Amino acid sequence: TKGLVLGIYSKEDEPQFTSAGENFNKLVSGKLREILNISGPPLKAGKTRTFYGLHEDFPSVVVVGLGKKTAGIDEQENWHEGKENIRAAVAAGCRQIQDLEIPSVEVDPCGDAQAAAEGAVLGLYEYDDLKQKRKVVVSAKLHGSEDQEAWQRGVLFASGQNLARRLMETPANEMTPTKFAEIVEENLKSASIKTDVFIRPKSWIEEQEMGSFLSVAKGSEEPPVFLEIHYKGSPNASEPPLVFVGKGITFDSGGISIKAAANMDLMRADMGGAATICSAIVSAAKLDLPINIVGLAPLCENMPSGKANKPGDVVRARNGKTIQVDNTDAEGRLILADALCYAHTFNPKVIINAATLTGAMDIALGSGATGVFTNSSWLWNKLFEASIETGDRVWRMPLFEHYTRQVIDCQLADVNNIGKYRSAGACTAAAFLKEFVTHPKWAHLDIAGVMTNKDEVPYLRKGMAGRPTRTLIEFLFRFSQ
Amino acid sequence: QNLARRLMETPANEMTPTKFAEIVEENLKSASIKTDVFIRPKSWIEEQEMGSFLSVAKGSEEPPVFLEIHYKGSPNASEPPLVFVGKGITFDSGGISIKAAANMDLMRADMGGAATICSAIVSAAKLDLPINIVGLAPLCENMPSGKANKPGDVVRARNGKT
Amino acid sequence: TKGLVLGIYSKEDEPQFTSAGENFNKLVSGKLREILNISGPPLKAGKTRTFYGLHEDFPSVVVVGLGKKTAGIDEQENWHEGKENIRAAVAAGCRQIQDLEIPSVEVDPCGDAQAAAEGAVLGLYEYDDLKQKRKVVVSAKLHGSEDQEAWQRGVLFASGQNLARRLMETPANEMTPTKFAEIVEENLKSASIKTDVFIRPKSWIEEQEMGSFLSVAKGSEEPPVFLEIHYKGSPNASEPPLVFVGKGITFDSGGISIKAAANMDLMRADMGGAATICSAIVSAAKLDLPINIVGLAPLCENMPSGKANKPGDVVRARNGKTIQVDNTDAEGRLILADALCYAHTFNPKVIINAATLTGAMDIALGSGATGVFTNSSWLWNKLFEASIETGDRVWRMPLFEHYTRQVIDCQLADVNNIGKYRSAGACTAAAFLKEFVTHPKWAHLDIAGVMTNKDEVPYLRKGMAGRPTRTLIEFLFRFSQ
Ligand SMILES: [Mg+2]
Ligand SMILES: [Mg+2]
Ligand SMILES: [Zn+2]
Ligand SMILES: [Zn+2]
């Protein structure tokens, strides 16, 4: 009827199966084991072999390599590793069932119900919607029934990421500053009714004296929308929140300080800041976590025009500081100077802001880890441990006065959007944001390296990657528990 | 000189084609009352058949203002003047033939032509010098847009030349 | 006769002096205190005021701001801070005595004998030698006599850095692969007689099957010299060593994969890898530390010629692995594939290699910290704590399979010198070096961001910075104790 993804590990006496696999073997009377011998070598991690007709009801039994049984927290790679194995191995498996055009598939728990699910789902995602030529929409349910609460945690966690991936991925002619808000609000409210949304317009942002976010929007004729998310998880409402901020340039052309045509079509994902953290709240509300969280994301676009932000321009952020706007492409810095200032109104506990800010971050670490600066070692620890679990790494980066210094000397004004020199890119830019933050637990997460995937993460197909959404989710789970 | 330095230096979002004129006029009149100013608008420049200055302005949505300074220093009014002209692009982004992001924030001082000579008259009127001088400076901005000046374009200057 | 650098801090009731300062005040009968009032505001950190004729024997008494008395380990800035204050404050002071053309100066201990010395000396250094127009050569002795062992630790530590600064700084027509070795050997032997040097020539390197270092040298007509340093600190000779490796391209023009004329004259400091670690041993031997250390540094040059290394070239490193040489400017990677392989011969405990490898590192952190990758958290800790003390920061960077993967797929060969993509620069390059390392305590230190100083570090004048030499020294002190 449908396919099945089985798992196996490496040697002992004969490479052991995952118990779903062992079970299914006994069932076809050893002949899965038997054909595995006959087929070729053994399956190291992530490798895949497909055995037809072993079962009546399962034409295609794909067996995938799970690596070491006891594979675990790796001191170097900074993650759990079995999980990492399982994720690529059922991803590998599920993409084989999807190429066999099998619309539904059943999947080995593989000892970590959650991981096989985040594999099956992250693994299968595309963003098919605008091609009439699409792959089969395969349905992936668990195999078994003993462990359902964590496989659904898989499908949950993986989906909230897939959310961001479709929110980033979609062309910025479709996924606008409004349509992004429309979907989010819709996603947050279908997540829980303990939620309020505020797709605040130009008038309110004007009213908020958000000079800097506004200076940015004015290039396009597409409207600014400052978005406000709320989830009231806490039993006592009055618990002060955790506030997520996120940059939402739906399209970045650089503005007057205009980009090269070389791969500028990826700037449709310069709203990844906004998308990631939004998907995290949509997800923390599906988990319905005992915490009040607040999504804040200035959605607008960077374009050149007769009224676009010019080089040399001093503008006023909400907080009273002026900014020389020396480079119109350093604009997340300005959109974020204001929603950061607004974050403090909420009396937060943690202000995690996130953004696709600098290509320099990409030059830095580049899709390994999502670089995170933070005046909180406590906070750093927290994001990092969560990243160990989820596998979407995070690497601390420096928030040193050294860097502030460069941004702070300024011809016209109080702060400059680009620092004195070429060097230290993400640090300069994070140094600019701290000028707009007085809280003891702030975290900049520059996501410009994890904006995309090709092959680097196995279980993600090519296209917007939606990172580090699950590490953000997992952090708020653990902070709630 | 310091006048020109603040007139050049200030961001072209603040120091516009109008705000430049506002300050100058203010500075020229506080220099002497033997002065007239004319912050002539698009209609007058249109009227003047200043096709070429106009072709330039049309990129921005910020208004052109052709400025006219006067100082009547001469005892006999009818002494013909000394005339200063000065370019006043408050911001130059190159337009469609667009600049590099490398230090384009200095183009806020592409109105230095206009600023220098204007400061000179403001100054010659404080000195109250026995000469009639005339400040003339087309203030406008260069930007790219759906109606910006394109490459290949023949436009008509006042004098008949294309 | 001579000048004097006094220190003061911020308020209490009236801003306190350092006891040298207090003492010198009583001595001119309060009139230093008195004129300080008369002069202007108070002196915040690093600021400087110069009072003539307060003393008979001290025409110029410069007083410098020391910031907070109790200023200490900063959780964010990752350093001791009083030290950092004192360093810029007497540096500030000493450069005032040197502009007053006062050939000798006496200096306030400032509560940290060592720090005021590393300030006075790092602070005063230039590399005057090739101008006939030079500043006065001011002599900086301590003020006092109570704490002499640590001020000399200052002058020691600062000098070993100044060594590297002159070794980097000097034109690569003068400071060749041989003249670098000549000075080092000379500096190591005048440091202790418990030392051997080996300025091994092409024949020996040929003999060593150091195909990769050799492929690099062959562009120039200037000779390769693989250098071998030794210091036998250990009481029992047979204690296996700590081995420092260091890249020594005296000049990098990129080779056939040739650089831009824009500031290529700084590549005269692409031997900073070799210089830093060499200065560290010269220094650990002056300290005469109970450890055997081994300096290893392939000195040669990158030039274009009729016999220069070409793009596409597979060459053989000592260890048997081949390298596609796709970019002739990624050449530290090759010079280092071989001296890394040779490091294991010595049965080391720690293999710290150091190099000015990637401009990407500069894009990364950029003169804040010297990025360090290491398969040893233990080792990381060690370099980092040392950096807390010295102030020459170090930032861990990732050594993830992710990155290896990119370098490892290779058309022709076993390893490629540049990885698959533009992104993640220093990590790709460090991933290449680990392919040439099997030891449990290896550390790559990419020094490309700290190659230079302008103003970023206060107490260093503009020019080659010589970083992170004291953190390396301080690490081997602490590892010896
Ligand atoms: Mg941008
Ligand atoms: Mg090079
Ligand atoms: Zn952007
Ligand atoms: Zn090099």
Angle, alpha carbons C457-C458-C461 (nearest 5°): 90
**Which helix (DSSP H) or strand (DSSP E) does residue C374 occupy?**
strand C370-374
Q: In this structure, are strands A60-65 and A415-416 parallel, antiparallel, or unpaired?
A: unpaired
Q: Does A391 reach chain C within 8 Å, measured CB to CB?
A: no
Which single residue is written with the structure tokens 């002497």? Answer: B32
Tokens (6 digits) for B85: 């002209």
Could you tell me if C458 and C391 are in contact, meaning their C-beta atoms sit under 8 angstroms apart? Answer: no
- Cα–Cα distance, C11 to C66 (Å, whole number): 11
Contacts of A328 in chain B (CB under 8 A): 101
Could you tell me if C155 and C121 are in contact, meaning their C-beta atoms sit under 8 angstroms apart? Answer: yes
Test C368 with A75 for CB contact under 8 angstroms.
no
Q: Which of C81, C52, C46, C51 shows the shortest CA–CA distance to C64?
A: C46
Is B97 labelled a binding residue? yes
Write out the DSSP string of C113-146.
Answer: HHHHHHHHHHHH----TT-SS-----EEEESSSS
Tokens (6 digits) for C456: 């970023």
Characterize A243-260 residue by residue with b for buried, 16 or more Cβ atoms within 10 angstroms of its Cβ, and e for exposed: bbbbbbbbbbbbbbbbee
- Cα–Cα distance, C71 to C77 (Å, whole number): 12
Ligand 2: centre distance to CA C216 (Å):
11
Domains of chain A: 1-162 (3.40.220.10), 163-480 (3.40.630.10)
Ligand 1: centre distance to CA C399 (Å):
29
**Stretch 26-65 of chain B: residues touching chain A, C-beta under 8 Å:** 59-62
- Cα–Cα distance, A85 to A115 (Å, whole number): 9
Q: Chain A: list its partners (3+ Cβ pairs within 8 Å).
A: B, C
Q: Does C263 reach chain A within 8 Å, measured CB to CB?
A: no
Tokens (6 digits) for C48: 């400087």
Phi, psi of A294 (to 5 degrees): -140, 120
Candidate from A77, A360, A405 with C-beta closest to C401: A77
- Cα–Cα distance, A60 to A105 (Å, whole number): 9
Q: Does A367 reach chain C within 8 Å, measured CB to CB?
A: yes
**Which helix (DSSP H) or strand (DSSP E) does residue C418 occupy?**
none
Candidate from B10, B14, B101 with C-beta closest to A329: B101
Residue A20's Cβ-count burial label (10 Å; 0-12, 13-18, 19+) is: buried
- Cα–Cα distance, C373 to C437 (Å, whole number): 13
- Cα–Cα distance, C166 to C179 (Å, whole number): 12
Test C367 with A449 for CB contact under 8 angstroms.
no
- Cα–Cα distance, B114 to B123 (Å, whole number): 14
Which single residue is written with the structure tokens 């801090």? Answer: C9
Tokens (6 digits) for A2: 């449908």
Ligand nearest to the CA of A448: 3
- The catalytic residue among A333, A382, A434, A461 is A333
Phi, psi of A344 (to 5 degrees): -70, -20
- The catalytic residue among B99, B126, B147, B150 is B99
Tokens (6 digits) for A312: 């040399």
The answer to whether residue A134 is catalytic is no
**Which helix (DSSP H) or strand (DSSP E) does residue B40 occupy?**
strand B37-41
| Side chain identity, residue C167 | L
Phi, psi of C189 (to 5 degrees): -75, -35
Phi, psi of A17 (to 5 degrees): -90, 160
Question: How many of the other CB atoms lie within 10 Å of CB of B161?
Answer: 9
- Cα–Cα distance, C175 to C413 (Å, whole number): 35
Which single residue is written with the structure tokens 């720090």? Answer: C115
Q: Which of B59, B57, B64 shows the shortest CA–CA distance to B147?
A: B59
The DSSP symbol for B107 reads G
Question: How many of the other CB atoms lie within 10 Å of CB of A133?
Answer: 5
**Phi-psi sector, B94: left (phi>0), alpha (psi -120 to 50), beta:** left
Q: Which of C80, C61, C26, C59 shows the shortest CA–CA distance to C143?
A: C61
- Cα–Cα distance, C373 to C370 (Å, whole number): 10
- Cα–Cα distance, B62 to B57 (Å, whole number): 8
3-state per-residue secondary structure call for chain A: CCEEEEEECCCCCCCCECHHHHHHHHHCCCHHHHHHHHHCCCCCCCCEEEEECCCCCCCEEEEEECCCCCCCCECCCCECCHHHHHHHHHHHHHHHHCCCCCCEEEECCCCCHHHHHHHHHHHHCCCCCCCCCCCCCCEEEECCCCCHHHHHHHHHHHHHHHHHHHHHHCCCCCCCHHHHHHHHHHHHHCCCCCCCEEEEEHHHHHHCCCHHHHHHHCCCCCCCEEEEEEEECCCCCCCCCEEEEECEEEEECCCCCCCCCCCHHHHHHCCHHHHHHHHHHHHHHHHCCCCEEEEEEEEEEECCCCCCCCCCEEEECCCCCEEEECCCCCCHHHHHHHHHHHHHHHCCCEEEEEECCCHHHHHHCCCCCEEEEECCHHHHHHHHHHHHHHCCCEEEECCCHHHHHHHHCCCCCCEECCCCCCCCHHHHHHHHHHHHCCCCCEEEEECCCCCEECCCCCCCCCEECCCCHHHHHHHHHHHHC
Chains B and C touch (3+ CB pairs under 8 A): no
Find the closest chain C residue to A76 by CA distance.
C375
Residue A146's Cβ-count burial label (10 Å; 0-12, 13-18, 19+) is: exposed
- Residue ranges for the known binding site of C for Mg(2+) are 252, 329, 331
Could you tell me if A195 and A232 are in contact, meaning their C-beta atoms sit under 8 angstroms apart? Answer: yes
Tokens (6 digits) for C125: 């250094």
| Helix then strand then coil, % of chain B, to nearest 5 | 35, 20, 45
Contacts of A45 in chain C (CB under 8 A): none
DSSP bridge pairs for C65: C8
Question: How many of the other CB atoms lie within 10 Å of CB of C133?
Answer: 5
Residue C465's Cβ-count burial label (10 Å; 0-12, 13-18, 19+) is: buried
What is the dihedral sign for C-alpha A447, A451, A456, A457? positive
Q: Does B102 reach chain A within 8 Å, measured CB to CB?
A: no
What is the dihedral sign for C-alpha A94, A96, A98, A103? negative
Q: Does B6 reach chain A within 8 Å, measured CB to CB?
A: no
CA distance A28 to chain C (A): 39
CA distances from C48 to A311, C7, C84, C86, C92 (A): 37, 9, 16, 12, 7
Q: Which of B39, B38, B28, B37 shows the shortest CA–CA distance to B128?
A: B28
Q: Which of B28, B2, B19 shows the shortest CA–CA distance to B122?
A: B28
- Cα–Cα distance, A49 to A241 (Å, whole number): 48
Characterize B106-140 residue by residue with b for buried, 16 or more Cβ atoms within 10 angstroms of its Cβ, and e for exposed: ebbbbbbbbbbbbbbbbbbbeeebeebbbbbbbbb
Tokens (6 digits) for C278: 């060499």
Angle, alpha carbons C147-C153-C159 (nearest 5°): 135
Length of chain C: 481
- Cα–Cα distance, A107 to A113 (Å, whole number): 9
The DSSP symbol for C352 reads E
- Cα–Cα distance, C423 to C358 (Å, whole number): 12
- Cα–Cα distance, C325 to C317 (Å, whole number): 12
Question: In sequence order, which residues have a C-beta less than 8 Å from that of residue C29 and are 6 or more positions away?
Answer: none
Q: Which of A441, A455, A279, A428 shows the shortest CA–CA distance to A367?
A: A455
Could you tell me if A151 and A116 are in contact, meaning their C-beta atoms sit under 8 angstroms apart? Answer: yes
- Cα–Cα distance, A275 to A184 (Å, whole number): 9
Question: In sequence order, which residues have a C-beta less than 8 Å from that of residue B84 and are 6 or more positions away?
Answer: B69, B117, B118, B120, B121, B133, B134, B135, B136
Q: Does C426 reach chain A within 8 Å, measured CB to CB?
A: yes
CA distances from A253 to A172, A187, A421, A441, C317 (A): 11, 28, 22, 33, 45
**Which helix (DSSP H) or strand (DSSP E) does residue C226 occupy?**
strand C225-232
Cα-Cα end-to-end distance for chain A: 41
Question: In sequence order, which residues have a C-beta less than 8 Å from that of residue C467 and are 6 or more positions away?
Answer: C161, C276, C370, C392, C447, C450, C451, C453, C457
Best probe of the A interface among C365, C372, C408, by most A CBs < 10 A, is: C365
**Which helix (DSSP H) or strand (DSSP E) does residue C389 occupy?**
helix C377-390
| Side chain identity, residue A142 | L
- Cα–Cα distance, C177 to C179 (Å, whole number): 6
Long-range CB contacts for residues A182-191, cutoff 8 Å, separation at least 24: A184/A227, A184/A229, A184/A278, A184/A282, A184/A295, A187/A163, A187/A282, A188/A229, A188/A231, A188/A278, A188/A281, A188/A282, A188/A285, A188/A295, A191/A231, A191/A282, A191/A283, A191/A285, A191/A286
Q: In this structure, are strands C463-464 and C452-453 parallel, antiparallel, or unpaired?
A: antiparallel
Tokens (6 digits) for C54: 């307060």
- Cα–Cα distance, C189 to C191 (Å, whole number): 5
Contacts of B42 in chain A (CB under 8 A): none
Best probe of the B interface among A220, A253, A310, A412, by most B CBs < 10 A, is: A310
DSSP bridge pairs for C453: C463
Question: How many of the other CB atoms lie within 10 Å of CB of A134?
Answer: 11
**Phi-psi sector, A320: left (phi>0), alpha (psi -120 to 50), beta:** left
Characterize B67-103 residue by residue with b for buried, 16 or more Cβ atoms within 10 angstroms of its Cβ, and e for exposed: bbbbbbbbeeeeeeeeebebbbbbbbbebbebbebee
Test A400 with C366 for CB contact under 8 angstroms.
no
Could you tell me if A50 and A358 are in contact, meaning their C-beta atoms sit under 8 angstroms apart? Answer: no
Question: In sequence order, which residues have a C-beta less than 8 Å from that of residue A398 and are 6 or more positions away?
Answer: A373, A427, C78, C365, C368, C369, C393, C395
Could you tell me if A64 and A92 are in contact, meaning their C-beta atoms sit under 8 angstroms apart? Answer: yes
